[PDB]
Design a protein around this ligand. Structure first.
Ligand SMILES: O=C1CN(Cc2ccccc2)CC(=O)N1
Length: 185
């Protein structure tokens, strides 16, 4: 791909984070904490899952960023509407305002409803995410495999401002403690 020149500097929004997440000082890394991280509750925080939003809101244009997923067993990545549900149980789907892919139990899937199997020969250590607002496109790229395409959501109905979306996943196994990191431009 040749989307690198639309690179944007993403930072994480503390206020949206599940209360167990630890966001680095530079707001570029996030990981699962051992316990509750001693923050007050608020209506923005994702309550049920280890999720956080980027601070940036996009309503036009083309945007690109990259995320490091090295040594994780489980995670979700993509974009979502600013108005997505924060509290309780929900599925990641375009009907609920999410355009995402994930790793879970040694398989990669796109967050369609129902979910779509992805075909990845080279497990990625870094993921590229491209959003074309006007075109209604969200695409995912395997940076470890020379930028190969993972998945394209087309005919997207964003229906609002978009925010970068992250889920570090649970760490029931003791093998998923590693952070998500926003990679430098
Ligand atoms: O990885 C974990 C975290 N988990 C707490 C938790 C629940 C809901 C949302 C965020 C955090 C408990 C557990 O058993 N392991």
């Amino acid at each position: 791909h040749h989307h690198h020149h639309h690179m944007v500097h993403i930072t994480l929004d503390r206020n949206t984070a599940n209360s167990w997440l630890i966001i680095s000082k530079d707001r570029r890394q996030v990981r699962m904490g051992d316990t509750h991280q001693n923050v007050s509750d608020n209506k923005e925080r994702f309550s049920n899952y280890p999720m956080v939003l980027g601070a940036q809101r996009f309503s036009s244009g083309k945007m690109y960023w990259e995320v490091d997923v090295t040594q994780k067993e489980a995670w979700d990545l993509g974009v979502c509407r600013d108005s997505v549900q924060r509290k309780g149980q929900f599925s990641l789907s375009p009907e609920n305002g999410f355009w995402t892919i994930w790793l879970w139990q040694d398989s990669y899937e796109a967050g369609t409803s129902p979910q779509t199997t992805l075909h990845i020969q080279v497990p990625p250590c870094q993921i590229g995410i491209f959003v074309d607002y006007e075109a209604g496109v969200v695409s995912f790229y395997n940076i470890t495999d020379h930028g190969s395409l993972i998945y394209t959501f087309s005919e997207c109905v964003f229906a609002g401002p978009l925010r970068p979306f992250f889920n570090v996943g649970f760490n029931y196994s003791g093998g998923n403690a590693a952070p998500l990191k926003l990679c430098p431009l």
